[PDB]
Amino acid sequence: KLPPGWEKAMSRSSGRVYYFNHITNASQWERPSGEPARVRCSHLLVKHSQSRRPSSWRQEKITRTKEEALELINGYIQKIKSGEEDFESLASQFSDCSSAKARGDLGAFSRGQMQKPFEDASFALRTGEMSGPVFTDSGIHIILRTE
Ligand SMILES: Cn1nc(CO)c2ccccc21
Ligand SMILES: Cn1nc(CO)c2ccccc21
Ligand SMILES: Cn1nc(CO)c2ccccc21
């Protein structure tokens, strides 16, 4: 039926069908469109107190809760989807990953290099697509597949 990871669901608030991807946590109204040795991704990381390393270039001691991290991630996704902000702009300003200085770009990678949920989401994204919140031991990620 649908590309890897996609399923149909019903909006609680509207009653209209939508599509959700359980690998990437992406969700959208439109039916999803249409694997490579490597992908290229950018990400925005929000760390929390249970991150493997609760520290970043933004904050020496990261104290926010995982739930608070998820709310930040949700808010960034909303601004990216509305066009109010660009992913690259938000990553540069707010990613707790040092890749913030490269607008979140991580370069190209294969399977067997990244943390597993990150890898799975990255390879399930089509070129140009963005994930929903993806959880790893680093924190919570928004992932943008660029190649
Ligand atoms: C961890 N990481 N990975 C990349 C790849 O762009 C990068 C670039 C600048 C700073 C930190 C970085
Ligand atoms: C600048 N740069 N680039 C990469 C991966 O390409 C990387 C990984 C760890 C730290 C810095 C890094
Ligand atoms: C080893 N590894 N795994 C991930 C996935 O979060 C990651 C992100 C940035 C730099 C290195 C990284």
Curated annotation (Swiss-Prot):
Broad enzyme group: isomerase
User: One Pfam family, short name please?
Assistant: WW
WW domain location is: 1-34
User: What InterPro entries is this protein classified in?
Assistant: PPIase_dom_sf, PPIase_Pin1, PPIase_PpiC, PPIase_PpiC_CS, WW_dom, WW_dom_sf
One GO MF term attached to the UniProt entry? tau protein binding
Q: Which GO terms describe its cellular component?
A: ciliary basal body; cytoplasm; cytosol; glutamatergic synapse; midbody; nuclear speck; nucleoplasm; nucleus
Q: Domain named PpiC: which ranges?
A: 36-147
Tissues/organs with expression: Expressed in immune cells in the lung (at protein level). The phosphorylated form at Ser-55 is expressed in normal breast tissue cells but not in breast cancer cells.
Biological role: Peptidyl-prolyl cis/trans isomerase (PPIase) that binds to and isomerizes specific phosphorylated Ser/Thr-Pro (pSer/Thr-Pro) motifs. By inducing conformational changes in a subset of phosphorylated proteins, acts as a molecular switch in multiple cellular processes. Displays a preference for acidic residues located N-terminally to the proline bond to be isomerized. Regulates mitosis presumably by interacting with NIMA and attenuating its mitosis-promoting activity. Down-regulates kinase activity of BTK.
Record's protein name: Peptidyl-prolyl cis-trans isomerase NIMA-interacting 1
Q: Which reaction does it catalyse?
A: [protein]-peptidylproline (omega=180) = [protein]-peptidylproline (omega=0)
Question: Anything noted about its domains?
Answer: The WW domain is required for the interaction with STIL and KIF20B.
EC numbers on record: 5.2.1.8
Localization terms from the record: Nucleus; Nucleus speckle; Cytoplasm
> What biological-process GO terms show up in the record?
cellular response to hypoxia; negative regulation of amyloid-beta formation; negative regulation of cell motility; negative regulation of ERK1 and ERK2 cascade; negative regulation of protein binding; negative regulation of protein catabolic process; negative regulation of SMAD protein signal transduction; negative regulation of transforming growth factor beta receptor signaling pathway
**Keywords, A to Z?**
Acetylation, Cell cycle, Cytoplasm, Isomerase, Nucleus, Phosphoprotein, Rotamase
Cite the post-translational modification comment. Phosphorylation at Ser-55 by DAPK1 results in inhibition of its catalytic activity, nuclear localization, and its ability to induce centrosome amplification, chromosome instability and cell transformation. Ser-55 is dephosphorylated upon IL33-stimulation of dendritic cells.
* Assembly and oligomerization: Interacts with STIL. Interacts with KIF20B. Interacts with NEK6. Interacts (via WW domain) with PRKX. Interacts with BTK. Interacts (via PpiC domain) with DAPK1. Interacts with the phosphorylated form of RAF1. Interacts (via WW domain) with ATCAY; upon NGF stimulation. Interacts with PML (isoform PML-4). Interacts with BCL6. Interacts with FBXW7, disrupting FBXW7 dimerization and promoting FBXW7 autoubiquitination and degradation. Directly interacts with RBBP8/CtIP; this interaction depends upon RBBP8 phosphorylation.
Residue positions where Phosphoserine is found in the record: S55, S92
